UniProtKB/Swiss-Prot annotation, chain A:
GO terms for biological process: translation. Part of the 50S ribosomal subunit. Contacts protein L32. The gene is rplQ. Belongs to the bacterial ribosomal protein bL17 family. GO terms for cellular component: cytosolic large ribosomal subunit. Keywords: Ribonucleoprotein, Ribosomal protein. InterPro entries: Ribosomal_bL17 (IPR000456), Ribosomal_bL17_sf (IPR036373). It comes from the Bacteria. This is Large ribosomal subunit protein bL17. One of its GO terms (molecular function) is structural constituent of ribosome. It comes from Thermus thermophilus (strain ATCC 27634 / DSM 579 / HB8).
UniProtKB/Swiss-Prot annotation, chain C:
This is Large ribosomal subunit protein bL19. InterPro entries: Ribosomal_bL19, Ribosomal_bL19_CS, Ribosomal_bL19_sf, Translation_prot_SH3-like_sf. GO terms for molecular function: rRNA binding; structural constituent of ribosome. Belongs to the bacterial ribosomal protein bL19 family. Keywords: Ribonucleoprotein, Ribosomal protein, RNA-binding, rRNA-binding. The lineage of its organism: Bacteria, Thermotogati, Deinococcota, Deinococci, Thermales. PROSITE patterns: RIBOSOMAL_L19. It holds the Pfam family Ribosomal_L19. Transmembrane segments: none annotated. The keyword Signal does not apply. It comes from the Bacteria. HAMAP family: Ribosomal_bL19. One of its GO terms (biological process) is translation. Part of the 50S risobomal subunit. Contacts protein L14. Forms a bridge to the 30S subunit in the 70S ribosome, contacting the 16S rRNA.
Swiss-Prot record, chain D:
Belongs to the bacterial ribosomal protein bL32 family. It comes from the Bacteria. This is Large ribosomal subunit protein bL32. Residues 1-22 have a biased composition (Basic residues). Keywords: Ribonucleoprotein, Ribosomal protein.
Swiss-Prot record, chain E:
NCBIfam families: rplN_bact. GO terms for molecular function: large ribosomal subunit rRNA binding; structural constituent of ribosome. One of its GO terms (biological process) is translation. The keyword RNA-binding applies. One of its GO terms (cellular component) is cytosolic large ribosomal subunit. The keyword Membrane does not apply. The gene is rplN. It comes from the Bacteria. This is Large ribosomal subunit protein uL14. It comes from Thermus thermophilus (strain ATCC 27634 / DSM 579 / HB8). SUPFAM superfamilies: Ribosomal protein L14 (SSF50193). This protein binds directly to 23S ribosomal RNA. Contacts the 16S rRNA of the 30S subunit in two different positions helping to form bridges B5 and B8. Belongs to the universal ribosomal protein uL14 family. InterPro entries: Ribosomal_uL14, Ribosomal_uL14_bac-type, Ribosomal_uL14_CS, Ribosomal_uL14_sf. Part of the 50S ribosomal subunit. Contacts protein L19. Forms a bridge to the 30S subunit in the 70S ribosome, contacting the 16S rRNA.
Length: 118, 7, 131, 59, 122, 204
RNA sequence: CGAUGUCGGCUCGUCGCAUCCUGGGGCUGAAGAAGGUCCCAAGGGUUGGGCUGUUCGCCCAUUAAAGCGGCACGCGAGCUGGGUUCAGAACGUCGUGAGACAGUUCGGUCUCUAUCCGCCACGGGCGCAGGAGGCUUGAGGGGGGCUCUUCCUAGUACGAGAGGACCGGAAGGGACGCACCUCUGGUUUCCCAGCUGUCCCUCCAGGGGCAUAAGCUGGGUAGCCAUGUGCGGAAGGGAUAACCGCUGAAAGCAUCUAAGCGGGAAGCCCGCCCCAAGAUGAGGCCUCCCACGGCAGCCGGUAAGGACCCGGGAAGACCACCCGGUGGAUGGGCCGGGGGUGUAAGCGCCGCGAGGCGUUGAGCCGACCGGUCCCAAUCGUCCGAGGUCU
RNA sequence: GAAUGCCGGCAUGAGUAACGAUAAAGAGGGUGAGAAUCCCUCUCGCCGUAAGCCCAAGGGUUCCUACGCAAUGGUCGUCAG
RNA sequence: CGUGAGGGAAAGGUGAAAAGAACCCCGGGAGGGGAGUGAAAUAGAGCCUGAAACCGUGGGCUUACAAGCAGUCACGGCCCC
């Protein structure tokens, strides 16, 4: 059973799934938009929204907390100086997921774009 | 193995 | 509907606010109403709070004492109407919320691990100074 | 286990009866309100890159 | 939760110090004894020249358990050991002292003499 | 013979006469009377009850007409209480008094496809001593060439739960008419949020 | 004999009754209690261990009882492999010997994929004269069916005493069953903290990886759970079995019977719980659409409606089912609460230092109870009646 | 018309088991008719008395570069022994 | 294939003549459609003839209350000559 369990497994063990989320996070915050599979995209929203929200708070603690996941000081500085001020008056919903029309050829995978919002 | 040894 | 509120609204008739705050590691005396044969009396149970499990009205706490050579753990509902009163005997300072590990300690091993919580002792001595 | 095995060859009738549930359903498609092309609903138009009235994707 | 094979301390001065439950005397096939239940047990360890010796098949009543027992008031009680007091076929203790606390449930089950000899009823 | 449609809220315990009493809280009323099955029209006696209001702009024309003939707003659910003819047009919790006994019908939690140990309390196999990939298996399912088959109703693996269940003769611990609350001692089928039916008991 | 695997166990049942217990009886060398024997009765029940490969049996401690047999000595394409039943080795014994022994001893390869029937679950199709959305009747199935102790009656009836009832009433158990998570007790793969070694970021401080598919350790919400909680077996009605009658001839008496009428089992029927109109014998009620256009038919556009798609769900293998789709709180975010962890970082002060103290129940923080349109359920498409014959 | 016959062809089982170590992947850019699978970059993970390096057997052009993708490669292929 | 002695296959046919299909079209290619050759192109090189199993497309009749070694005897319905 799975009654009221939150969180996809994505056929990865505990540490592989965390690193997957962290790497997707770095990639999305680097380019502003990425393509992944639809299930990965949807899971990415929550992970990245929380790091952006902490960057809205902007204190030293937030920065160090975000660095636990993102690890790259230059990227965090970008998140704190360029990304987060875009969202000071936005209460959640810092990312959007739109589904792409065409599946991957080699495995039929349905794709989606995940992007930071305006 | 082989056969069931019916002996 | 809000199902959570409806339960809290059911439990509201039974919620107590008279009892004092305490933490794991505090030495506490629970004056507890007991039935026996024909009469019902008040039997004090005094020991170290080793556990507070919280669930609003449904929170309970576990008190441990050594009686005549034997360890005894007594679990109480924090909002039970059989609890007459709870007296803080001593403030101890634990580093964790569950003190199961003291079941395995000698008496001086415990005294060394749950030293007196001078800060909250002073909070208690400062209070009671009312007028 | 003792290696179960088909007792009789399946007849042409039964093999094809089994496949009465194999036909593909055609893709669900709707016209894109911008370029009129047929595309799956709730997906970005792969022909003009529009979704929800605005342009999202270069095509 | 006592069953056959369970060892129990002896909370009296009969002479026995450790007994091993071999039967729960509560119907045809009870799985477990709690406080107030009688068991049949062999005596595994005695002190010399007490009433009961090693090898005796005795009756006892469980007075303390490590499995906590639940009460209608919504509370529970748990002891550090599993302990019983040895009785005869009249519920009466065969020794003259009871050591350590005992559960209040014994009173309702008619083991009154044990309740009085006990230094604490919890 | 009286009934009402309900909603399982959650469990708690309350304190009654220095005893802790585990309860399930049920939001019962109000249940408007939507149709009356009579011996003349339908061949039996029963009330069709309604429960929980629904978006009128969400209820199709065939159901609109049905509600109209009763003069009632759209409700999310219709259920019949059999052999019940309430005097009024709206059934509330106050058909029950504390102390009465009730039967409660809900839909059990669904275990999905369930193994023989979870569904039927089978013993499974040994976990050591040579046991070979059968630790949770059912063992034998029959005999040999006589009868050469498996009984109907044979206990085997399959979907378990998410079925209608009636627990009977529960004590009513309280009625709170200001909130349409019904407290019942003990456990009731299904999840919090699930629809349940509360009928007077059939045990004597 | 171009193979029907062979003991026992474990698992899973099911059946017979020549009945072990529980229910009903008659007779008794039946005072009572307790037994004996036979009759009716298969609904349910029929324990845990020591020994042995054992079946059986004996023993221990209980029990209402610890029944006997069938199902290929039920069940190895379900498991085991102790025994038996190859090849090694040894003892006793037999044989000059090679070797031999339902004699003993130690060891000894038990085969991933289910086509058909059958079984458990779940769908798709078409059917149920118009087509729909709901709510139902219950033919017929299935589940269940146990029992003990104490107290009252009453230390009464009975009995010299020992002892000790019927009937009727009350309380509390055991095992089993269904559901549940408030409590008790588990789990809780990253929810919090602490710790070692190493490498790294960025030197300090602070962190990250790896040490398992959690490095280790102390805890742990929701969910799933039992060891935990609630509830069930009925009651009641009917027809009976053995057995006991009332009235009553044949047969002036007698006779439960030949006419007629009573009483009477844990059993039988109904009653309780669950499925159920593919019940093709395709049922019933409430409501909605409606006579459209072209040679019981026909092909196009609709109708009431439905599906597709999408956001999801204590529903779920897929399918199904249920909720929602901007006139929206469905999921994600955010916020508040619950809950867990147990006082973050940084700074300040004390100590030579490991550390300590304060800010501070802080910081972090899955699922739980809610709020909030910030993000996403955009936009739409396709099926879908005109109702046969007296 | 049969010889568990012989040689070959094609069925069934079945869109089923499986796709060969549970060290692990993600994204951006490029190339191309076509890209999860080729090239480049960044992140992540695994070996490190080896899963690194050098000899000897054995193998015998598998080496380097250009042009290729029918087949071989357990998928794909623009890559390649 | 086997260390080796040794074992030891399968595989024939365009047409009279290459006249072996310029060129155009879809396609990366493969392949096909036209044009063209030829008495003939389901003689187009995967080439004479081209059986059978086996697979598919289209049509006639038939089938979702039914019990079967699958046929046979009879009658009726529909379709065809
Ligand atoms: Mg499961
Ligand atoms: Mg489930
Ligand atoms: Mg699981
Ligand atoms: Mg959820
Ligand atoms: Mg996670
Ligand atoms: Mg997997
Ligand atoms: Mg995997
Ligand atoms: Mg993987
Ligand atoms: Mg997979
Ligand atoms: Mg790891
Ligand atoms: Mg991508
Ligand atoms: Mg991916
Ligand atoms: Mg700063
Ligand atoms: Mg975090
Ligand atoms: Mg989309
Ligand atoms: Mg798609
Ligand atoms: Mg590909
Ligand atoms: Mg592929
Ligand atoms: Mg709740
Ligand atoms: Mg102490
Ligand atoms: Mg200290
Ligand atoms: Mg302090
Ligand atoms: Mg096998
Ligand atoms: Mg096997
Ligand atoms: Mg095997
Ligand atoms: Mg096999
Ligand atoms: Mg065959
Ligand atoms: Mg076959
Ligand atoms: Mg065949
Ligand atoms: Mg055929
Ligand atoms: Mg065919
Ligand atoms: Mg088939
Ligand atoms: Mg298939
Ligand atoms: Mg199709
Ligand atoms: Mg003692
Ligand atoms: Mg002692
Ligand atoms: Mg002695
Ligand atoms: Mg000894
Ligand atoms: Mg004693
Ligand atoms: Mg005392
Ligand atoms: Mg009350
Ligand atoms: Mg509905
Ligand atoms: Mg319901
Ligand atoms: Mg359910
Ligand atoms: Mg449940
Ligand atoms: Mg199982
Ligand atoms: Mg179960
Ligand atoms: Mg189980
Ligand atoms: Mg079950
Ligand atoms: Mg078992
Ligand atoms: Mg077992
Ligand atoms: Mg087991
Ligand atoms: Mg195992
Ligand atoms: Mg084995
Ligand atoms: Mg094996
Ligand atoms: Mg197996
Ligand atoms: Mg195993
Ligand atoms: Mg099995
Ligand atoms: Mg067989
Ligand atoms: Mg067999
Ligand atoms: Mg048969
Ligand atoms: Mg289901
Ligand atoms: Mg009751
Ligand atoms: Mg309310
Ligand atoms: Mg329910
Ligand atoms: Mg044979
Ligand atoms: Mg054969
Ligand atoms: Mg054969
Ligand atoms: Mg054979
Ligand atoms: Mg065979
Ligand atoms: Mg076993
Ligand atoms: Mg049997
Ligand atoms: Mg008989
Ligand atoms: Mg009897
Ligand atoms: Mg009897
Ligand atoms: Mg008798
Ligand atoms: Mg007598
Ligand atoms: Mg008698
Ligand atoms: Mg008799
Ligand atoms: Mg029986
Ligand atoms: Mg029986
Ligand atoms: Mg032993
Ligand atoms: Mg044994
Ligand atoms: Mg034996
Ligand atoms: Mg024997
Ligand atoms: Mg006996
Ligand atoms: Mg008896
Ligand atoms: Mg036995
Ligand atoms: Mg037998
Ligand atoms: Mg038997
Ligand atoms: Mg036989
Ligand atoms: Mg035999
Ligand atoms: Mg035998
Ligand atoms: Mg035999
Ligand atoms: Mg057998
Ligand atoms: Mg067998
Ligand atoms: Mg086997
Ligand atoms: Mg066997
Ligand atoms: Mg078999
Ligand atoms: Mg077999
Ligand atoms: Mg077989
Ligand atoms: Mg063996
Ligand atoms: Mg032997
Ligand atoms: Mg041999
Ligand atoms: Mg000799
Ligand atoms: Mg001789
Ligand atoms: Mg000799
Ligand atoms: Mg021998
Ligand atoms: Mg032999
Ligand atoms: Mg022999
Ligand atoms: Mg012999
Ligand atoms: Mg032997
Ligand atoms: Mg020997
Ligand atoms: Mg042997
Ligand atoms: Mg060995
Ligand atoms: Mg062996
Ligand atoms: Mg295998
Ligand atoms: Mg099959
Ligand atoms: Mg199998
Ligand atoms: Mg068959
Ligand atoms: Mg089959
Ligand atoms: Mg079948
Ligand atoms: Mg169907
Ligand atoms: Mg109709
Ligand atoms: Mg309908
Ligand atoms: Mg019904
Ligand atoms: Mg019926
Ligand atoms: Mg039927
Ligand atoms: Mg029945
Ligand atoms: Mg019964
Ligand atoms: Mg008396
Ligand atoms: Mg009297
Ligand atoms: Mg007496
Ligand atoms: Mg009685
Ligand atoms: Mg049963
Ligand atoms: Mg049920
Ligand atoms: Mg169950
Ligand atoms: Mg539950
Ligand atoms: Mg809970
Ligand atoms: Mg719990
Ligand atoms: Mg707990
Ligand atoms: Mg974390
Ligand atoms: Mg480290
Ligand atoms: Mg660096
Ligand atoms: Mg450092
Ligand atoms: Mg620090
Ligand atoms: Mg590393
Ligand atoms: Mg490493
Ligand atoms: Mg380890
Ligand atoms: Mg690793
Ligand atoms: Mg770690
Ligand atoms: Mg842990
Ligand atoms: Mg824990
Ligand atoms: Mg939990
Ligand atoms: Mg919990
Ligand atoms: Mg829980
Ligand atoms: Mg559960
Ligand atoms: Mg239990
Ligand atoms: Mg019970
Ligand atoms: Mg007479
Ligand atoms: Mg007469
Ligand atoms: Mg008569
Ligand atoms: Mg009669
Ligand atoms: Mg009668
Ligand atoms: Mg009964
Ligand atoms: Mg039903
Ligand atoms: Mg119908
Ligand atoms: Mg129906
Ligand atoms: Mg019909
Ligand atoms: Mg018909
Ligand atoms: Mg019929
Ligand atoms: Mg009809
Ligand atoms: Mg109908
Ligand atoms: Mg009707
Ligand atoms: Mg589904
Ligand atoms: Mg789903
Ligand atoms: Mg699904
Ligand atoms: Mg679908
Ligand atoms: Mg539906
Ligand atoms: Mg609902
Ligand atoms: Mg809908
Ligand atoms: Mg809607
Ligand atoms: Mg829409
Ligand atoms: Mg929402
Ligand atoms: Mg709502
Ligand atoms: Mg929300
Ligand atoms: Mg979700
Ligand atoms: Mg809180
Ligand atoms: Mg808290
Ligand atoms: Mg501090
Ligand atoms: Mg601090
Ligand atoms: Mg610090
Ligand atoms: Mg200093
Ligand atoms: Mg400290
Ligand atoms: Mg907090
Ligand atoms: Mg947070
Ligand atoms: Mg959160
Ligand atoms: Mg919070
Ligand atoms: Mg809850
Ligand atoms: Mg609003
Ligand atoms: Mg459209
Ligand atoms: Mg012939
Ligand atoms: Mg052959
Ligand atoms: Mg031959
Ligand atoms: Mg042949
Ligand atoms: Mg051949
Ligand atoms: Mg051959
Ligand atoms: Mg050939
Ligand atoms: Mg061949
Ligand atoms: Mg062949
Ligand atoms: Mg072939
Ligand atoms: Mg074929
Ligand atoms: Mg084939
Ligand atoms: Mg095939
Ligand atoms: Mg498939
Ligand atoms: Mg298959
Ligand atoms: Mg499969
Ligand atoms: Mg395979
Ligand atoms: Mg393989
Ligand atoms: Mg597979
Ligand atoms: Mg490995
Ligand atoms: Mg692999
Ligand atoms: Mg592994
Ligand atoms: Mg490794
Ligand atoms: Mg990435
Ligand atoms: Mg990738
Ligand atoms: Mg990549
Ligand atoms: Mg770009
Ligand atoms: Mg590729
Ligand atoms: Mg490609
Ligand atoms: Mg790429
Ligand atoms: Mg790869
Ligand atoms: Mg590359
Ligand atoms: Mg990056
Ligand atoms: Mg090294
Ligand atoms: Mg070579
Ligand atoms: Mg070459
Ligand atoms: Mg290739
Ligand atoms: Mg290729
Ligand atoms: Mg290719
Ligand atoms: Mg080529
Ligand atoms: Mg290949
Ligand atoms: Mg390939
Ligand atoms: Mg390969
Ligand atoms: Mg290329
Ligand atoms: Mg190379
Ligand atoms: Mg060779
Ligand atoms: Mg050879
Ligand atoms: Mg060679
Ligand atoms: Mg040769
Ligand atoms: Mg040749
Ligand atoms: Mg030829
Ligand atoms: Mg020629
Ligand atoms: Mg010629
Ligand atoms: Mg050209
Ligand atoms: Mg051209
Ligand atoms: Mg082209
Ligand atoms: Mg072209
Ligand atoms: Mg190319
Ligand atoms: Mg060409
Ligand atoms: Mg073409
Ligand atoms: Mg051509
Ligand atoms: Mg010509
Ligand atoms: Mg041609
Ligand atoms: Mg021709
Ligand atoms: Mg020709
Ligand atoms: Mg010729
Ligand atoms: Mg030819
Ligand atoms: Mg040909
Ligand atoms: Mg041909
Ligand atoms: Mg042909
Ligand atoms: Mg074809
Ligand atoms: Mg055809
Ligand atoms: Mg056709
Ligand atoms: Mg019929
Ligand atoms: Mg028909
Ligand atoms: Mg037929
Ligand atoms: Mg027919
Ligand atoms: Mg024939
Ligand atoms: Mg015929
Ligand atoms: Mg005829
Ligand atoms: Zn478009």
């Amino acid at each position: 059973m799975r009654h009221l369990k939150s969180g996809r497994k994505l056929n990865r063990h505990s540490s592989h799934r965390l690193a997957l989320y962290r790497n997707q996070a770095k990639s999305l915050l680097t380019h502003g938009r990425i393509t992944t599979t639809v299930p990965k995209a949807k899971e990415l929203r929550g992970f990245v929204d929380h790091l952006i929200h902490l960057a809205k708070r902007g204190d030293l603690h937030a920065r160090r907390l975000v660095l636990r996941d993102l690890q790259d000081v230059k990227l965090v500085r970008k998140l704190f100086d360029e990304i987060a001020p875009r969202y000071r008056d936005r209460q959640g919903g810092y990312t959007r997921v739109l589904k792409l029309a065409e599946r991957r050829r080699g495995d039929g995978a349905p794709l989606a774009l995940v992007e930071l919002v305006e | 193995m082989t056969h069931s040894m019916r002996c | 509907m809000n199902r959570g509120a409806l339960i809290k609204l059911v439990e509201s008739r039974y919620v107590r606010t008279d009892l004092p705050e305490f933490r794991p590691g505090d030495t506490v005396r629970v004056s507890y109403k007991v039935k026996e044969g024909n009469r019902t009396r008040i039997q004090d149970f005094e020991g170290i709070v080793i556990r507070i499990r919280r669930n609003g009205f449904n929170t309970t706490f576990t008190v441990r004492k050594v009686s005549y050579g034997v360890g005894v753990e007594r679990i109480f509902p924090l909002h039970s109407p059989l609890i007459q009163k709870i007296d803080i005997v001593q403030r101890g300072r634990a580093r964790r919320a569950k003190l199961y590990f003291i079941r395995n300690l000698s008496d001086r091993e415990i005294r060394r691990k749950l030293r007196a919580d001078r800060k909250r002792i002073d909070q208690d001595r400062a209070a009671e100074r009312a007028a | 286990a003792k290696h179960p095995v088909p007792k009789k060859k399946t007849s042409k009738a039964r093999r094809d009866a089994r496949r009465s549930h194999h036909a593909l359903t055609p893709p669900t498609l709707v016209p894109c309100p911008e370029c009129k092309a047929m595309k799956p609903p709730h997906t970005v138009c792969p022909e003009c890159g529009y979704y929800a009235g605005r342009k999202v994707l270069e095509v | 939760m006592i069953q056959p094979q369970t060892y129990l301390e002896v909370a009296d001065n009969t002479g026995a110090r450790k007994i091993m439950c071999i039967r729960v005397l509560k119907g045809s096939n009870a799985k477990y004894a709690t406080v107030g239940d009688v068991i049949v047990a062999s005596v595994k360890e005695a002190i010399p020249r007490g009433a009961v010796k090693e090898g005796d098949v005795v009756k006892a009543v469980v007075v303390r358990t490590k499995k906590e027992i639940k009460r209608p008031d919504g509370s529970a009680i748990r002891f550090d050991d599993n302990a019983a007091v040895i009785i005869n076929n009249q519920l009466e203790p065969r020794g003259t002292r009871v050591f350590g606390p005992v559960a209040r449930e014994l009173r309702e089950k008619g083991f009154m003499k044990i309740v009085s000899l006990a230094p604490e009823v919890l | 013979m009286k009934g009402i449609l309900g909603v399982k809220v959650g469990m708690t315990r309350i304190f009654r006469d220095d005893r802790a009493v585990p309860v399930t809280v049920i939001l019962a009323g109000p249940c408007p009377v939507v149709q009356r099955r009579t011996p003349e029209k339908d061949g039996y006696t029963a009330v069709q009850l309604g429960f929980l209001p629904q978006n009128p702009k969400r209820v199709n024309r065939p159901l609109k007409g049905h509600f109209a003939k009763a003069g009632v707003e759209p409700v999310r659910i219709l259920r019949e209480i059999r052999d019940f003819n309430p005097e009024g047009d709206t059934v509330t919790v106050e058909i029950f008094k504390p102390g009465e006994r009730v039967d409660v019908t809900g839909t059990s939690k669904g275990r999905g496809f369930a193994g023989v140990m979870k569904r039927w309390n089978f013993a499974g196999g040994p976990d050591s001593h040579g046991a070979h990939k059968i630790h949770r298996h059912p063992g034998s399912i029959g005999n040999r060439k006589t009868p050469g088959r498996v009984y109907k109703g044979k206990k085997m693996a399959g979907h378990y739960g998410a079925e209608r269940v009636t627990v009977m003769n529960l004590e009513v611990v309280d009625v709170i008419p200001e909130e349409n609350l019904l407290l019942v001692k003990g456990a009731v089928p299904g999840p919090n949020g699930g629809l349940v039916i509360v009928r007077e008991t059939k045990k004597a």
